[PDB]
Write a protein that binds this ligand. Structure first.
Ligand SMILES: *[C@@H]1O[C@H](CO)[C@@H](O[C@@H]2O[C@H](CO)[C@@H](O[C@@H]3O[C@H](CO[C@H]4O[C@H](CO)[C@@H](O[C@H]5O[C@H](CO)[C@@H](O)[C@H](O)[C@@H]5O)[C@H](O)[C@@H]4O)[C@@H](O)[C@H](O[C@@H]4O[C@H](CO)[C@@H](O)[C@H](O)[C@@H]4O)[C@@H]3O)[C@H](O)[C@H]2NC(C)=O)[C@H](O)[C@H]1NC(C)=O
Ligand SMILES: *[C@@H]1O[C@H](CO)[C@@H](O[C@@H]2O[C@H](CO)[C@@H](O)[C@H](O)[C@H]2NC(C)=O)[C@H](O)[C@H]1NC(C)=O
Ligand SMILES: *[C@@H]1O[C@H](CO)[C@@H](O)[C@H](O)[C@H]1NC(C)=O
Ligand SMILES: *[C@@H]1O[C@H](CO)[C@@H](O)[C@H](O)[C@H]1NC(C)=O
Ligand SMILES: *[C@@H]1O[C@H](CO)[C@@H](O)[C@H](O)[C@H]1NC(C)=O
Length: 157
């Protein structure tokens, strides 16, 4: 029912993808997205201490040097409060999702966005999710690279 999406390292993509490559991070959670997007005022304002409890999730912002908490707070504000009601079960789910992502390539890993790399003739996956979706920036007929793992098609197992 929820889309789980994450960033993947890629030295060829400026921003979080490059920062992850430099730090030896392969997968960094972007979000867990139910159908409903939160509108209005959050029932609770996420603190830095709460957001830092999602261990290994890197912020997409250079303003924190890709650490915490701009993306983490944005996730709680836009997808968290209205769906989970309380920050505690959301922090635990996000943290466990990230822990699984840190362990290696997950159960279902489908490409979302690629950076086609001319040199290696590979579709370098910059963002993946746990369900198939139409692709963006992915060259037809090329193999896919999920944080160095070579796959035939857009979905990795
Ligand atoms: C996919 O995303 C959804 C979010 O869309 C995730 O579901 C959410 O999971 C949260 C648990 O992790 C759960 O949080 C608890 O919510 C209760 C309140 O629950 C009651 O309210 C809601 C609506 O008002 C109803 O939820 C029911 O919805 C479904 C269909 O009816 C079904 O799942 C089931 O019937 C649910 O019961 C329902 O009326 C609820 O009973 C809070 O009380 C919880 O609080 C915990 O308890 C404390 C107080 O005792 C609180 O202070 C603590 O901090 C404590 O931890 C807790 O917040 C959400 O209700 C649920 N949201 C929805 C819309 O279902 C789902 O888990 C995701 N799945 C995956 C696999 O990623
Ligand atoms: C993190 O990974 C573990 C291991 O895959 C998950 O636990 C499994 O959950 C499935 C159902 O989704 C069950 O069939 C098994 O009981 C579990 N296996 C083990 C070895 O414990 C867990 O769901 C994952 N959590 C998140 C949030 O991704
Ligand atoms: C990241 O992925 C590569 C390629 O699969 C693997 O060799 C390496 O050990 C992983 N590093 C971490 C920190 O998980
Ligand atoms: C950003 O983080 C990395 C690794 O932790 C480090 O190389 C760098 O000095 C940090 N700070 C700035 C201002 O780039
Ligand atoms: C989150 O997962 C880590 C492993 O990455 C674990 O050590 C830690 O206790 C967890 N934190 C919370 C708040 O669950």
């Amino acid at each position: 029912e929820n889309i789980t999406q994450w960033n993947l390292q890629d030295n060829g993509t400026e921003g979080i993808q490059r920062a992850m490559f430099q730090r030896g991070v392969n997968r960094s959670l972007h979000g867990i997205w139910p159908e409903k997007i939160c509108t209005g005022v959050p029932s609770h304002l996420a603190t830095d201490t709460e957001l830092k409890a999602i261990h290994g999730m890197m912020d997409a912002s250079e303003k924190t040097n890709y650490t915490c908490c701009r993306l983490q707070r944005h996730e709680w504000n836009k997808h968290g409060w209205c769906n989970w009601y309380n920050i505690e079960p959301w922090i635990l789910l996000m943290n466990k999702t990230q822990a699984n992502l840190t362990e290696g390539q997950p159960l279902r890993e489908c490409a979302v966005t690629c950076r086609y790399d001319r040199d290696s003739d590979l579709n370098v996956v910059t963002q993946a999710r746990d369900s198939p979706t139409p692709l963006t920036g992915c060259k037809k007929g090329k193999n896919f690279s999920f944080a160095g793992i070579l796959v035939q098609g857009p979905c990795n197992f």
